[PDB]
Amino acid sequence: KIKENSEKIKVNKTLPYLVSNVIELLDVGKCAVIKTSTRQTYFLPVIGLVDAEKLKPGDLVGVNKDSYLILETLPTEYDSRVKAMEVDERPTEQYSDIGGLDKQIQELVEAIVLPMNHKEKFENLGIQPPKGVLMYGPPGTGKTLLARACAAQTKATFLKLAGPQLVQMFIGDGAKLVRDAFALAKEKAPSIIFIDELDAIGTKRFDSEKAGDREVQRTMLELLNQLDGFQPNTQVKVIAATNRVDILDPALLRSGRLDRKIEFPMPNEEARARIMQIHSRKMNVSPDVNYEELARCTDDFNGAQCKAVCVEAGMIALRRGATELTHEDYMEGILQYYA
Amino acid sequence: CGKTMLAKAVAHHTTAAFIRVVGSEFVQKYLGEGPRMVRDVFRLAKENAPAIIFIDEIDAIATKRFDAQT
Amino acid sequence: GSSRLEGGSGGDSEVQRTMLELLNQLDATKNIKVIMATNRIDILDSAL
Amino acid sequence: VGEVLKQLTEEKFIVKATNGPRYVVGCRRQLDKSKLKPGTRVALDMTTLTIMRYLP
Amino acid sequence: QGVAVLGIALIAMGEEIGAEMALRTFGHLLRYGEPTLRRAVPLALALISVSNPRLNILDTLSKFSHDADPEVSYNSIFAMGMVGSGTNNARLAAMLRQLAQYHAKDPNNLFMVRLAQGLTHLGKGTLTLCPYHSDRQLMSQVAVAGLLTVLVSFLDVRNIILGKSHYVLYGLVAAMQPRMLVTFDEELRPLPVSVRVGQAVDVVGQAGKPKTITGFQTHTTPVLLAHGERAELATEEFLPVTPILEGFVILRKNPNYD
Amino acid sequence: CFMCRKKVGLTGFDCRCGNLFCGLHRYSDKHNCPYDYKAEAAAKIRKENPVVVAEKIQR
Amino acid sequence: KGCLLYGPPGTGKTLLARAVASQLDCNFLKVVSSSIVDKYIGESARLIREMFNYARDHQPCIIFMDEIDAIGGRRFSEGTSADREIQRTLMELLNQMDGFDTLHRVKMIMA
Amino acid sequence: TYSRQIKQVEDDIQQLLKKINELTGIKESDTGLAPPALWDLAADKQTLQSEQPLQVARCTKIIKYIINVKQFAKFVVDLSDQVAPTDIEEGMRVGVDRNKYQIHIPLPPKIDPTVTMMQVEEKPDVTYSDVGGCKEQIEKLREVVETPLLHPERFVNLGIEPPKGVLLFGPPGTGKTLCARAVANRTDACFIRVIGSELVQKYVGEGARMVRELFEMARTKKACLIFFDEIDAIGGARFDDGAGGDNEVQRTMLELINQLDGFDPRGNIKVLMATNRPDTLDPALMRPGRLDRKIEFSLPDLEGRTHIFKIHARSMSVERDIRFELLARLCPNSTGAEIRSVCTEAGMFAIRARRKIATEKDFLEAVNKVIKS
Ligand SMILES: Nc1ncnc2c1ncn2[C@@H]1O[C@H](COP(=O)(O)OP(=O)(O)OP(=O)(O)O)[C@@H](O)[C@H]1O
């Protein structure tokens, strides 16, 4: 009749196990101090269908709305849609197709992947892996490129920056988004956190303009805490991205927080040639190209402008349905008195 | 300067009922309990005829009207 | 009687609404007389 | 869970339940009324709401 | 009285304001009328708005199709099917299926509602019977003949149809006709062309050359227009042989100048 | 590990030919990368392309 | 009853805190200025008084505020509802540090 | 004569209407049911079988599934006559009934009123062939906005990326808004105008939200054409200096850019950026990876002026014969808007002459007046 006991336990555990917090544990056997959505506080001398030890103050557990007995616990929850934003459909690009930039990719790939895969070398050397990384995209050229290309490893998760400033005017909160984000990263396997447009946060922290400022400073300080506090934070990899290089928080700055601040320079002639080649790889280019001389014509054509120009050249040829490069209608796609 | 002793020292030296209040511990919870609890403490003070109602610094409340708002 | 500005501007049911009602009632007085008084002229209402 | 507020007579106490309402209830005998005091927490029962067990 | 109201409808079928207000009068009749006049009104409503499922008329027809009187309900349900004839409007179909659900225990009503969905889906909304024609200018004699036969038959739905004879719907089928804009050019060549289609605007009187197109929806040649929308073709691509574009048309390939 | 330089660098960029090219010779123009870049472009663009159906056909 | 740790960004403050926490071996409460909450009202002071009550019950204890800059702010007047709430939270801290909440066996750290 | 006949017959109509009202009597007062009948007993019964609440489902834990629901009362429920388990989605609007709380009907996502009415589903009343003086610009816009949509297999065969992002700029008033309206009317895709002012709110948090919901709405829709106007208002130079308090607009602009092109595909959304001062525009936004085919509207030439003139002359009551090329010649350096205002002035001059014909003389007088002012 043990089975019959199990089935009747199941049936009396109908289904709508109203979920409740596990706010506190005690003993006298152990007990529970659960709290419910409907603000209430139930002491349970008998906790219920749980080991009464895996519980820990702060947890979500199903409960019988009437019996108030802790039923099957549920995995922790993450709010502010941190979980929803923390998704990624394995960005399709597989190669590191960027262009001339080589040292930047070198250091970033090393400091990120090598700890992940070949941590054997690090442990043998007795070295904790490289510290949190920053990646200056002053113009943005190649910034998201490197991020997305890095989104081609074996398997991991990437926490994008998306509205950490989602704070209520009425004081708001110290980036509960940040709290939940770091919690999720901590709980999941080796994870990475791409702080996009980090400039949106971060500052000298002393300017006293007005409200909203101070909210941004609490969020910043929450970031600082999340990686500099009484926490090893071993299983995390922060990669920051910013363009307002100069104006940023001196503490957020580096040295346990954002080290190895890779820099994105203006592509040289070779780099411009390489990027235009990369974007033209799939282009139906005729067997006649002056790629290098087009790179020379670039004349400070750093950013995605190369991609935009290849697209505009495609449309230009498509005026007439061709597959060849005029090489000068290409400059006019690029874009009196004396002369 | 030493306001808080003068407070505590009279709270001891006195031979009368005394009630201490915090500057702003009466603003919390669902809407509308602040007025209720302030009138409650004043009712208790009335009940204790020789009552002395000391409140810690006030600045966090009553500093300004802050004009009409919503 | 604070200067009519900031929020509400007639969309608020507060002292601004009371000011609007007062102005509507005023205009008309025949022989009654009204003496407003204040410490500072800085704050004033154009409508009033 | 709710904290007692006053030792009303002997078998009567005013307890403000955390959910918000304030009640007056009597306590099971085996509770050493001396123990509980203004501010002490207690676990009232569902139906009758008699003080069953004081808590720290 | 039923035939009298049907004749009021059979006199008012053209002028848009007159038809709208004939519907208003028929609503007056149904509300302050005998049960006979009540059964009669929905048929006249269908006559006025054939294949023209406007929201107000649909509301009224559903209103007086959920009526207690079975004959009133029959007339109203079939009238609503007719006003939805060959339109496939989502709102109309949803209302229709809800009414079918409600009349779950009524066999004849369920039959009629099934025919109502069939009407809403005529040729999957490709064939639309219409007395009027040619921008509300031409009178369809055969169409009016068939429609009047059907509606006279439905004047007494209980005996005429719920019984031996139910093929006046086939008479209506014969009366059917499409609404379509194949631009089959010279030698029936299916020359395609971009056409801007929009609800008519009653060009008379307005300023300049009124934009008969409301909500320009350039949709090539194989379009179906609608109960009351017309086309303007394009800037100067071709020269249509008719300015009332409808059905089989020819487009002279002689633009004055590109 | 591309033939020029016989490079084995961990940074080695691993291309659609699965080959950690020389840092300076990672490009298809340089190493005759035998991949159908253009065909993949056509397929992907066809998949992702939005087409306006004019929203007139209906059941 | 309290100590302060003037420090630029990384002088050794948090690691110092770790070392003292592992050394003393009594109760430790490492708390951060990211304790601000809002439910159409303020409860930061309530959380603060919960902290202080916990400590007083666990008399032997080291509370450690860190990043006191944020909540510490300043007594700005007529700033905004946010400024008033933050200064109220600060004021709870002041009242429960000094005042009738006088302690005997707890120790406070700031950085 | 005719006027008096009107007045009489409209008097008859007003009398008839008041007579109907007084005779029969239909009114509402407070709430009403003017439409006869409306009996809804079955509606009540099914309402009882329904009248459900809704919340936001969170997670389906197990593979009988465990849906998690949050509102003023948390819950963990599942199962329903509804199928397509959670419609292969979690963060929807569940729409679950009471009474054991296991029966559901999916619902669309809640969106703030701002974006709800910014959807602007109306179709502006403009069409091509009503545009003169910017034939090249309209050609570019037509290409970019239509070729990817109209018979676009030819646009994919070449293995060329589909351009996405166009910024219209030029002097104040050149037919940019007119061309935007024309494209909106002609297009058949989820069109969404945007007003910059509606993105500026009380302190941080508002603009970024509304932008994100707008973007996810566009993504949910099959294919979107978004039509930002007032870009000069929304988004500017990133420099702070004294904007340390005004950084809210810059923040919102930053989120806008990230959604335009960040660490995620942006989708089949084509952006139109209306402006007339294309210099203060922020470099990050102006990056051609987000505004591919910037278009410049210039003052019309003589032929464009003439074409706009005849377009505006489309209206009736105009002269039988006018000589539009000379009209354009007399008005050089004139915007198409100024051509429109010249036609308006000619009409007003005809009225102020009590003339029902707009003569070339009227056009000349209007041109003289506008030139002098
Ligand atoms: N070196 C590069 N290789 C490939 N694509 C590039 C490169 N530089 C720019 N791009 C193009 O730029 C777009 C991605 O933006 P990118 O990563 O350069 O950041 P950004 O938008 O300029 O950043 P920021 O926010 O700092 O302005 C894509 O179109 C990508 O093709």
Ligand SMILES: Nc1ncnc2c1ncn2[C@@H]1O[C@H](COP(=O)(O)OP(=O)(O)OP(=O)(O)O)[C@@H](O)[C@H]1O
């Ligand atoms: N007369 C005094 N004798 C001794 N200590 C004093 C005296 N006045 C002030 N103090 C010092 O300050 C404290 C008493 O003042 P306390 O700081 O409690 O209140 P306060 O000076 O009014 O300022 P606050 O209200 O901001 O705390 C004591 O702890 C002592 O260190």
Ligand SMILES: Nc1ncnc2c1ncn2[C@@H]1O[C@H](COP(=O)(O)OP(=O)(O)OP(=O)(O)O)[C@@H](O)[C@H]1O
């Ligand atoms: N004096 C030090 N001796 C040894 N390691 C140190 C020292 N200071 C910092 N570190 C290293 O830096 C990290 C801890 O930083 P630290 O405790 O100095 O931060 P902090 O001063 O609290 O920073 P912040 O002021 O920016 O909030 C650990 O990696 C620790 O090894």
Ligand SMILES: Nc1ncnc2c1ncn2[C@@H]1O[C@H](COP(=O)(O)OP(=O)(O)OP(=O)(O)O)[C@@H](O)[C@H]1O
């Ligand atoms: N190419 C054109 N064809 C016809 N009318 C035109 C043309 N260009 C301008 N107009 C006239 O000018 C006015 C168009 O103003 P619109 O709002 O479209 O301009 P804009 O370029 O967006 O700039 P602005 O907002 O500064 O006026 C209307 O009067 C329109 O008739």
Ligand SMILES: [Mg+2]
């Ligand atoms: Mg304009």
